[PDB]
């Protein structure tokens, strides 16, 4: 509250550890259906199924250009690319198996950096 300052959670290296969370989901080999935006023009449906589109290399331009306000809303974008995935494919389809995997590793990344 006013004047009531709750301690100071240090949050001056979370951009650089984001980045590199972000570099290893990259680089990771089940990375490929996340790596750009779903091409709304050639895939029926998801324009208008997914609301929030959401992918790799457009949280990579967020991330360098000072669009994520806390750590929080990286994990939201990070969140939402697996999120729309499950929504659209199914699970044991190979996109479908790609983002169980990535959201996997994305959180045990999450989790052993952050929490
Ligand atoms: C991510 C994601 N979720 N669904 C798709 C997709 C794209 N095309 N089709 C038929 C889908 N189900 N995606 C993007 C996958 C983009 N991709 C395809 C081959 N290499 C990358």
């Given at each position: 509250?006013?004047?009531?300052?709750?301690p100071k959670?240090?949050?001056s290296?979370?951009?650089?550890?984001?980045?590199?969370?972000?570099?290893?989901?990259?680089?990771?080999?089940?990375?490929?259906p996340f790596?750009?935006?779903?091409?709304?023009?050639?895939?029926?449906?998801?324009?208008?199924?997914?609301?929030?589109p959401?992918?790799?290399?457009?949280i990579?331009?967020?991330?360098?250009?000072?669009?994520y306000?806390?750590?929080?809303?990286?994990?939201?974008?990070?969140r939402?690319?697996?999120?729309?995935?499950?929504?659209?494919?199914?699970?044991?389809?190979?996109?479908?198996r790609?983002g169980?995997?990535?959201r996997?590793?994305?959180?045990?990344?999450?989790?052993?950096?952050?929490?």
């Amino acid at each position: 509250s006013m004047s009531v300052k709750k301690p100071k959670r240090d949050d001056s290296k979370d951009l650089a550890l984001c980045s590199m969370i972000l570099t290893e989901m990259e680089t990771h080999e089940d990375a490929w259906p996340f790596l750009l935006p779903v091409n709304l023009k050639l895939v029926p449906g998801y324009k208008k199924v997914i609301k929030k589109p959401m992918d790799f290399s457009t949280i990579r331009e967020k991330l360098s250009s000072g669009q994520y306000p806390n750590l929080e809303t990286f994990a939201l974008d990070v969140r939402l690319v697996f999120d729309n995935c499950e929504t659209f494919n199914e699970d044991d389809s190979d996109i479908g198996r790609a983002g169980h995997n990535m959201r996997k590793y994305f959180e045990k990344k999450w989790t052993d950096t952050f929490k």
